[PDB]
Swiss-Prot record, chain A:
The lineage of its organism: Viruses, Riboviria, Orthornavirae, Pisuviricota, Pisoniviricetes. This is Spike protein S1. Changing residue 50 to S: In strain: Omicron/BA.1. Changing residue 44 to S: In strain: Lambda/C.37, Omicron/BQ.1.1, Omicron/XBB.1.5, Omicron/EG.5.1. It comes from the Viruses. Changing residue 47 to R: In strain: Omicron/BA.1, Omicron/BA.2, Omicron/BA.2.12.1. Changing residue 47 to N: Reduced host ACE2-binding affinity in vitro.
Length: 50, 50
């Protein structure tokens, strides 16, 4: 598994054409978003391709 | 039931909401294959098994 290329799984709203987003941020969970952790929700935005 | 004699239950003909499930069970593991839980309250299905 080549863990060098990842892709955004969670986005609030889709994106207009020909823009790229590199901001790393932890998903929310129906409450003030988890500040560093992951529960039922609050997953990490980027997942490695492998 | 035990794994080698698991119990199956058919659930259909009803109004399903998958937002109440977060209450019950601390959810040591909660992951889906083919769907995402936040979107599950939306799609319509044929017959759901458990």
């Amino acid at each position: 598994g080549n863990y060098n290329y990842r892709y955004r799984l969670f986005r609030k709203s889709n994106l207009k054409p020909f823009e790229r987003d590199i901001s790393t941020e932890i998903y929310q969970a129906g409450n003030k978003p988890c500040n560093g952790v992951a529960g039922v929700n609050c997953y990490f935005p980027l997942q490695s391709y492998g | 039931a035990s794994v080698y004699a698991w119990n199956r239950k058919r659930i259909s003909n009803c109004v399903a909401d998958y937002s109440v499930l977060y209450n019950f069970a601390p959810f040591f593991a909660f992951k889906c294959y083919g769907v995402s839980p936040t979107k599950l309250n939306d799609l319509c299905f044929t017959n759901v098994y458990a």
